[PDB]
């Protein structure tokens, strides 16, 4: 099946979490990927992404508009094309970040 894709770019805007008929969360956001040109950054590819499970609660509590991210997903369709994120992460090319999750909250 595969037809997987890795996309690196910035978030067009703060994620948008959804919870539809099943009580399930869907972190929506579109990744904007800029290329590289040369004649003497140019134009961008905007990719509407979807991320589920509690992988979306983090993708919400962690990422925000303008955030550069690395997205590993799969290309699905139904007239548009969207990536069903399997993995998402804040690219440390131009930033830092504290991590982990196992204890705390109550």
């Amino acid at each position: 099946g595969d037809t997987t894709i890795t996309i690196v770019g910035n978030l067009t805007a703060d994620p948008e979490l959804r919870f539809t008929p099943s009580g399930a969360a869907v972190a929506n956001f579109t990744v904007a990927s800029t290329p590289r040109i040369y004649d003497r950054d140019g134009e961008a590819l905007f990719l509407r992404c979807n991320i589920w499970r509690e992988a979306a609660e983090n993708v919400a509590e962690s990422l925000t508009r303008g955030a550069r991210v690395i997205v590993s997903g799969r290309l699905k369709q139904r007239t548009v094309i969207e990536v069903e994120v399997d993995e998402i992460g804040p690219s440390l090319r131009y930033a830092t970040a504290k991590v982990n999750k196992a204890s705390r909250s109550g």
Copy 2:
């Protein structure tokens, strides 16, 4: 072409940073994915710093890069790297281009 790879695994060690006479930084760390694939990775410039600055042993990471060679074995010429937000959360940011 420039044959590329993407590894989603766990860091075996803590990014080991160093600086080249070029004034350029370079961090090394091997990503271990799960039947066990151990890929050593390299990262240059500021990215090197950011990695050491915020990454540690057994941390979930998504890595995109390019395979390389010579000595032989294949290592990774990481382009982008970051924490995996699968089983964890993490806030970020920096900025200032050129």
Copy 3:
């Protein structure tokens, strides 16, 4: 970067070749992978010719390329393309660089 893709599917039609005022060729064909993903693909220069020359409807193909945009939707800027030797055999060749 230049975000890349690899599609393993079946050609819906027969590569449709054309020539640009630039004297350059260009073949179009949509690759349909299996819950059905339909990716339109583009191929330029000699490659265009070779494709039309040897590919036809519902043929198993491995395609590596780059996603693009504008009009919108995403199409594929194929780099390499060839018959899939999974459920079939096929002999080849050409040559002469520059």
Copy 4:
């Protein structure tokens, strides 16, 4: 699991088919991938590949030394690294090819 990889390059030499303790065929061959540089083709990455099932009988009856190919596989290990080809095909960037397989032989 994934850690899949697509590699495009020429075959270092005619494939080498194996049939080991199970009566199973293993089409072995190593893909040589050349890069692109510029200062004013450079150096190659050699990737030992493995391909099974009857996907190897074709990979044997079809490809030969110098053949440019597109390989979709997975990176496995056990001190070396080898790609376990899921898909293989003759790149039509610089060549042509007749196809299909369903009737004939006896």
